[PDB]
Design a protein around this nucleic acid. Structure first.
Ligand SMILES: Cc1cn([C@H]2CC[C@@H](COP(=O)(O)OP(=O)(O)OP(=O)(O)O)O2)c(=O)[nH]c1=O
Ligand code: SF4
Ligand SMILES: [Mg+2]
Ligand SMILES: [Mg+2]
Ligand SMILES: [Zn+2]
Lengths: 548, 254, 253, 251
DNA sequence: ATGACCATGATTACGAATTGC
DNA sequence: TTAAGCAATTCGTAATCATGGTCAT
């Protein structure tokens, strides 16, 4: 069942078991047609900017399961006004009302079964996290993290199933009640941590809730010190948990010394769980940790955030961005780093690039990616709509068709880099460095409908003077630079031949064989898409050096 | 030092707007006999090639072949800032970092000195491998533009049938079809309305309308267009100038 | 075959200029005396009726009655390909599956043949009102002006008192009232305005009025007939026929 | 009761269309002499002041001084006015709306419109200052120059040695246009005026693009520049003027 | 001469993808 | 017969609407 069935069958089995052990029968409620959406959470406004002050982070321990098991929320505790009036139940002792308006009964009347299921799931997650705590290997650390992450999905899948209209026993009352409770709880903890930690009570600064993501509140205490910020965050989380029901508990999880809040549900910073060394560099929602963006953007954003947060030198970051722009414009970026992957869908109303690509591959090759497969492509240059400009990276590598470098500069790399460097250097200074001051039109080995039977008049060098009737790589006007252009060409050829040798010898070492031919189709190797590019470029540069 | 003083800015404005959309970055080669610039679109099926001889200009002080990395959008923005009574002059120093454009009005008035930055497009200078075309037809440019427009309104693939001395356009779309059959016309009153077909070879070729929609934009410079067609060689659309041409090279889709 | 040749290509264009915006699909029923076609909007508030006689043709031959229904947006594309010196000619065979439009000149042999695929299974033609309580006539450009002026202030326009044409519209930003009286001393047989029984007071929908006034291209004089609790008649005169619009009023109490 | 009778219906139309884009809510303070109206821009950088005299109306009663507090609604109503029409403003005592009578020479065509009028105008104290430079040039020339130089940059640099120089330095390049006063042509309307101290200010392009929309009331536009005060852009009327106060950019 | 009509930016809407709780 | 939830951003393409350039008048 774990491979051909979703998360509903697990909660169904748990519910049936707990019911059988409690003398209860689950009705066969005919599933309603569908629904649009009910009211979820209330994500706080993200005060954007660059924050060098340590921002503590306080989040809830399994917010929705804690809310469920804290208020006796279940199917078997769901009363209404008529029921409480007929039974004459006292308020606040026998029955309670949720912020959504629904009625439930306290644990004094009947213990639910969703609380028991959630107790089981959180007691499993506790040991799954303890095992990660007592573990050293980073790969095994990630494995135990994935194991823990799958035990908090099911604990949240309980609430999801109670709120899932498509599926058996859809009780939207309980899902709406837990969402209302969560919203009110984050609002109350924001108010409390802004009230207690201020000037009047005897603190240095005014604590401000910088950002909130429905369970967390990134309070900024103002103290530039980091250890003091961690201690204050711990004290604040403890005081807040003091003001809630037993299963609920706020915990100080992390601190962000350099904090860059890009937008809503999008930020980055340094993970400080210890006041002596940062753990990692987070990237929430940014185009680097996404999958519908070429890996070049990911690498560039990683390096830029490393230079800005870890090393704190914006000048080097801007220089690297300029170098990357120059590489993009001059076709100095490998095809492997310009590959965008998108998950195919069954039906498409608005045509998409990967859908049309898969259709063209089926029409051309003989078989294409079915639904659910991640189709990868690059954006070739053209005039028509973008969905008509997308090609298999192997087809591009074979046919040598040019890549739309301006597209990758403006549509892929411009916006994320701008959004991450603007809070530091301003909007205009950040956008100025994205002007196209240089271009390299390849127009090479593209023999096709028109790119065939065309000449290259071989204009002069360093001046492009068409009056090159006199033979030689230079015209009589700028002949005084005949000792520098040769140096440039020769050093280009040197770099290219060194790289070519390294790549092909490396391919032979990988193939294990030396006396045999290496015909490798592995397109997931970084050196793939690069050996052929370097071979072509070295061929052209050597043919250019042969003019002297 | 290049100093190309024109006679009227509208000439150069139309020259640029004729192909500012298909291509966007060109290399203008100001040599010792005028200006010449060729480029190819990103689809690599359209090749624009412009030649303005020194006769079209009024003054030409360029003594050393210089190159200008023109971005057509910025240059069109600059040219839109010109009047219809100005003698636009393009000036450039020895090593050009920027180009100067002066729309000095004939009557003593406000001179308009704009300094447009230049780039280095680092592209190759191409040239068509010539061949005796199968049919070199001449046709009034306005009629050709109207034909392309109303036909492309239907479908996205226009076909040309040059047979038995009657130029024929056909287009088969989803909503229907459209077939224009113009006979070879000749008259003494209107020299522009002149169509003289060549029976050298019958030509049945189909081009994408997405490129003819850009070809027909340079229809204001030349009152008549010369279309050279060949079943193997790529078709040519020549818009003749006062001392040059704005000829496009298009290849039938296949 | 079906041979219907218009005197000028620019006639069919203006004829369809009224349909294109409001009418989605229409089945043209050809006869031996001319062409007629009707349709109703998807909301069933406005009814269009086309009547084109032979007198607006240089030659007509429709021996057998024909019935073809197509799209106006696609047909308008075909009609826009017509020069001001060409002659339109509808061409359809027996039981047509597609219509053929033909443009020809008179000094240079230029044949422009366009095909157009054509059926909604609906040929409901119903007209009931033949007597209205008031009849008026005014320039087509003047009425459209008042209509588009009043539509800016509200979503409805109320049009009739003794010997006066009143146009009133009340909305959020304010109100607007235009009162036009028939007598004019201009002595021009076109910009004149006539009015001929019982007071009429009915409010219509602006959007429908905007779609109706777009028929001002067919002629230079539109007649408006009003009748309480009856769809008004918005007719545009034509040399051999007319294009009349039947817009139903709104319940006001 | 306030009852104005515009000489031409197109007059008030051009008057409102010259500034209906940079401001949304204005108060028309109508008095015995005429109507005064001023308001700040939505971004609070552009100040406009409207002045109309009794000399531009065929009949102007204005019994009591009343304040007329949406430029969009006024423009939508004024759009109905045709050429052969005499727009008549009508305001009662303490009004909540306003009648705009579009009468015609032919008394068989009458069109009246009512427009619902609360604006808390932060009334500023405008005062005639002694500006460093006082020039005047044709309105079509200035509008053309601004439309030209605004494409190159968002900021425009404007007089040294009795000669103005419009310069705009952007990213795609820079543009320069020289300016010399002259009255050589018999017609003066195409003449350039200029009068004390060198001045070099820089204004945002967008506000200049909104101001040049006032090139529909007069064929000339006067410019008064001061290094320590916002500029003065005024278009002359037969019975008043419509002036603009633009705050320059930072140095 | 006056808007007419075609062409060209702003603005809105929604599909599609992915990630954040 | 079977499928956890919602909130949020970003990008592409179309539809619609304001506004200017040029033409029959
Ligand atoms: C990830 C995820 C989360 N939710 C909801 C449910 C409540 C909130 C809290 O989620 P969170 O990942 O931060 O972790 P959390 O459990 O709250 O806390 P701890 O790691 O125990 O401290 O988000 C969900 O419905 N489906 C999901 O897949
Ligand atoms: S490209 Fe990769 S898989 Fe192929 S030979 Fe080189 S290293 Fe091995
Ligand atoms: Mg949490
Ligand atoms: Mg969270
Ligand atoms: Zn040289």
């Amino acid at each position: 069942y774990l491979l051909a069935r979703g998360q509903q069958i697990k909660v169904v089995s748990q519910l049936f078991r707990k019911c059988l052990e409690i003398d209860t029968v689950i009705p066969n409620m005919q599933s309603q047609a569908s629904d649009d959406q009910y009211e979820g959470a209330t994500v706080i406004e993200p005060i954007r900017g660059y924050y060098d002050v340590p921002i503590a982070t306080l989040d809830f321990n399994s917010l929705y399961p804690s809310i469920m098991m804290a208020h006796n929320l279940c199917y078997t505790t769901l009363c209404n006004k008529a029921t409480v009036e007929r039974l004459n139940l006292k308020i606040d002792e026998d029955y309670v009302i949720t912020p959504n308006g629904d009625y439930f009964v306290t644990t004094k009347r009947r213990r639910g079964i969703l609380p028991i299921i959630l107790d089981e799931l959180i007691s499993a997650r506790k040991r799954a996290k303890k095992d990660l705590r007592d573990e050293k290997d980073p790969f095994k650390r990630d494995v135990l993290n994935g194991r823990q992450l799958a035990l908090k999905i099911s604990a949240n899948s309980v609430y999801g199933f109670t709120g899932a209209t498509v599926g058996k026993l859809p009780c939207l009352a309980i899902s709406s009640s837990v969402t209302a409770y969560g919203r009110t709880m984050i609002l109350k903890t924001k108010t409390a941590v802004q009230e207690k930690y201020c000037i009047k009570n005897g603190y240095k600064h005014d604590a401000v809730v910088v950002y909130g993501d429905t369970d967390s509140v990134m309070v900024k205490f103002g103290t530039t010190d980091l250890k003091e910020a961690m201690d204050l965050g711990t004290e604040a989380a403890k005081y807040v948990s003091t003001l809630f029901k037993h299963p609920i508990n706020l915990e100080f999880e992390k601190a962000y010394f350099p904090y860059l809040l890009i937008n809503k549900k999008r930020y980055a910073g340094l993970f400080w769980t210890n006041p002596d060394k940062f753990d990692k560099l987070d990237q929430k929602g940014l185009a680097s940790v996404r999958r519908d963006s070429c890996s070049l953007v990911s690498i560039v954003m990683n390096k830029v955030l490393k230079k800005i947060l870890i090393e704190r030198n914006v000048d080097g970051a801007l220089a690297f961005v300029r170098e990357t722009i120059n590489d993009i414009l001059h076709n100095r970026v490998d095809i492997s780093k310009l590959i965008i992957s998108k998950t195919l869908a069954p039906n498409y109303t608005n045509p998409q690039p990967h859908a049309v690509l898969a259709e063209r591959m089926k029409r051309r090759e003989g078989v294409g990616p079915n639904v659910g497969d991640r189709v990868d492509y690059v954006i070739i240059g053209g005039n028509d709509k973008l969905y008509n400009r997308a090609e298999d990276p192997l087809f591009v590598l074979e046919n040598n068709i040019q890549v739309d470098s301006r597209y990758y500069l403006t549509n892929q790399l411009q916006n994320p880099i701008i959004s991450i460097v603007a809070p530091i250097i301003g909007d205009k200074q950040a956008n100025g460095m994205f002007v196209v001051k240089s271009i390299k039109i390849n127009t090479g080995s593209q023999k096709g409908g028109l790119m065939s039977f065309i000449k290259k008049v071989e204009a002069c060098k360093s001046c492009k003077g068409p009056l090159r009737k006199g033979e030689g790589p230079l015209c009589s006007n700028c002949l005084a630079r005949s000792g520098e252009l040769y140096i440039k060409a020769l050093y280009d050829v040197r770099d290219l031949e060194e790289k070519y040798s390294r790549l092909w010898t490396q391919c032979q070492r990988c193939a294990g064989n030396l006396h045999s031919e290496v015909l490798c189709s592995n397109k997931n190797c970084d050196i793939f898409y690069m050996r052929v590019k370097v071979k072509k470029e070295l061929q052209e540069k050597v043919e250019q050096l042969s003019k002297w | 030092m290049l100093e190309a003083k024109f006679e009227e800015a509208s000439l150069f404005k139309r020259i640029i707007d004729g192909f500012k959309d298909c291509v966007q970055l060109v290399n203008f080669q100001c040599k010792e006999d005028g200006i010449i610039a060729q480029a190819v679109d990103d689809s690599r099926v359209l090749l624009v090639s412009l030649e303005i001889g020194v006769e079209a200009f009024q003054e030409y002080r360029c003594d050393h072949p210089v190159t200008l990395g023109m971005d057509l959008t910025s240059l069109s923005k600059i040219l839109r800032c010109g009047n219809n009574t100005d003698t636009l002059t393009l000036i450039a120093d020895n090593t050009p970092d920027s180009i100067i454009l002066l729309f000095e009005d004939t009557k003593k008035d406000r001179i308009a000195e704009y300094s447009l930055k230049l780039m280095d497009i680092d592209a190759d200078f191409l040239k068509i491998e010539e061949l005796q075309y199968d049919s070199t037809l001449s046709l009034p440019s306005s009629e050709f533009s109207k034909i392309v427009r109303d036909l492309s309104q239907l479908s996205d693939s226009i076909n040309i049938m040059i047979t038995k001395e009657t130029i024929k356009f056909v287009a088969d779309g989803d909503i229907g079809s459209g077939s224009v059959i113009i006979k070879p016309f000749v008259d003494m009153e209107h020299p522009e309305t002149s169509i003289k077909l060549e029976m050298d070879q019958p030509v049945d070729l189909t081009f994408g309308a997405k490129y003819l929609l850009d070809i027909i934009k340079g229809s204001s410079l030349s009152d008549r267009v010369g279309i050279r067609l060949s079943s193997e060689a790529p078709a040519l659309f020549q818009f003749d100038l006062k001392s040059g041409f704005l000829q496009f090279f298009l290849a039938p889709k296949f």
